[PDB]
C-alpha cells in the first residue's frame, strides 16, 4: 500500500511563515485521511465542494497540501470569499475553492516565553494576492527620495512583521498550524484515491 505522505506535512517539525507558505504536491498515492488525527491534536476543519464523510470514496487528479502558521483569530480568513490582512497579502483561497482547511492550536510548539519572532506575515502589497499566489519578497518599500539601502526608516517601509507568539496570549492570538488540502479534478486520469476506492 503506497499511502500519500500526509505525515510530511502534518508532522513537520517546523512550519512555514504564512507569507512564505509551503506547498506539498500529492500525486500517485492512496490518500488515507484518517492519519490527520495522529498528528494534529484537537484539530478543526471546514470543507468546500466536498463532503468530508465521502473523502475515502473519492478520486482526484492531484492533491495539494499547503501549510503555514497564523494566529487563531485569523483562521477565518483561510476560507473562500474572505478578505483581510492575511487573505489580501499573505495567502488567498479562490471563491471556487474545492478542498478542506484544517487548523489546530500549536501554542505548545510555536510560542516562546519572550515571543517567537520566527513566524512572519506581510503588512502591505502593491495589489491583492491572487489565488495560491506566493510573495516572499523582503524588499523595503522606498516611498521618498532617499534610497533605503536595505534599512528601514523614514519613508522606507519593511513589508513584513513577526507574530511574536507568547504562551500568555488568549487563543485568538496563539499560533495555529494550518493545512489547506486542495482537491484538483481535471478531465484526466485520477492519481489520488481514497483507500475505499
Amino acid at each position, epitope marked *: 500500500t503506497n499511502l500519500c505522505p500526509f505525515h510530511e506535512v502534518f508532522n513537520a517539525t517546523t512550519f512555514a511563515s504564512v507569507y512564505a507558505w509551503n506547498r506539498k504536491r500529492i500525486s500517485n498515492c492512496v490518500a488515507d485521511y484518517s492519519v490527520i488525527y495522529n498528528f494534529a491534536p484537537f484539530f478543526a476543519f471546514k470543507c468546500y465542494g466536498v463532503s468530508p464523510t465521502k473523502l475515502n470514496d473519492l478520486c482526484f487528479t*492531484n492533491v*495539494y497540501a499547503d501549510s503555514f502558521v497564523i494566529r487563531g483569530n485569523e483562521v477565518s480568513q483561510i476560507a473562500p470569499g474572505q478578505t483581510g490582512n492575511i487573505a489580501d497579502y499573505n495567502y488567498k483561497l*479562490p*471563491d*471556487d475553492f474545492t478542498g478542506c482547511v484544517i487548523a489546530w492550536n500549536s501554542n505548545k510548539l510555536d510560542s516562546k516565553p519572550s515571543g517567537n519572532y520566527n513566524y512572519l506575515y506581510r503588512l502591505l502589497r502593491k*495589489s*491583492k494576492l*491572487k*489565488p*495560491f499566489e*506566493r510573495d*516572499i519578497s523582503t524588499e523595503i518599500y522606498q516611498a521618498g527620495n532617499k534610497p533605503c539601502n536595505g534599512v528601514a526608516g523614514p519613508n522606507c517601509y519593511s513589508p513584513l512583521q513577526s507574530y511574536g507568539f507568547r504562551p500568555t496570549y488568549g487563543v485568538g492570538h496563539q499560533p495555529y498550524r494550518v493545512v489547506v488540502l*486542495s482537491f*484538483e479534478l*481535471l*478531465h*484526466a*486520469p485520477a492519481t489520488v484515491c481514497g483507500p475505499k476506492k
Partner: antibody
Amino acid sequence: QVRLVQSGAEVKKSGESLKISCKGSGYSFTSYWIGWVRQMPGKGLEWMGIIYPGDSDTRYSPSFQGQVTISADKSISTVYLQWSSLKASDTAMYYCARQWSHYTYDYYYWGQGTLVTISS
Amino acid sequence: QSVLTQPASVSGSPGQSITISCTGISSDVGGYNSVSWYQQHPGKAPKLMIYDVTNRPSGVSNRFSGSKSGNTASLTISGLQAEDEADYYCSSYTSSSTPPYVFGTGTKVSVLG
C-alpha cells in the same frame, strides 16, 4: 462547462480603433487569469498578456507592452482587447485562453478566436 | 523574453515515430512552472496535448508523449497517422518571469503519402 466565447470577425481600415471581447461562462469569472494570444496569417502563436478580472491586474508581454490595451468588465464576465489606431500588421487571429485550474497552468481552455482583418 | 526554438518542420511516414525538440526553456525553482505542447489544425483553436511536461488530458491518444532534458523539451508521436498532420507548439510557463508564458516557434508535421 468552462466556455470562452469571443466576438465576431472584424474588417477594419488602417487607423481605425477596435475593441474585441471574450465572455466567460460556467465558472467563477473573477477567480482566474485570462490570456490573449495573437496569430498572424501563417505564423505562430504569440502570447500577448493576461488580466485578472477580479481586480484588472494586467501583465503584458514585453513585445505588446503599450501596443494594445487589455481590460475587463467583471460585471458581465467579459475581457477585452483594444487598439487605438490599427496598423496592417495587426491583421491576425486573436484568441483568449484560460489555464486548466488553479494548480495546472497550461492553457486547456480556448475561445473560438476572432479574425481581425486590416485592409486598404 | 527567451525564444523556445523548434524545428520549422519534421516529417515521417504513417506508423513511424517522430520527435520535435523545444530548446531554451528556463524555470524558477522558487515559483510555479509548466511545459506544454499544443496541436493546431487549420482553421481551429490550439489544443493542449501534453501538460506539466509529460501528462495527457483525457482523450488525447497515448501515441503522444512528452519529456524534458536540461533546457530542452521533446514531443514524440509514435504510430504516426494522417490526422497528426498539423502545427505543434511547445510552451513554457514560469510564474515569476517576464513574460510568464512563451510559445515556441512552431513545427509543421507532415505525414508522407
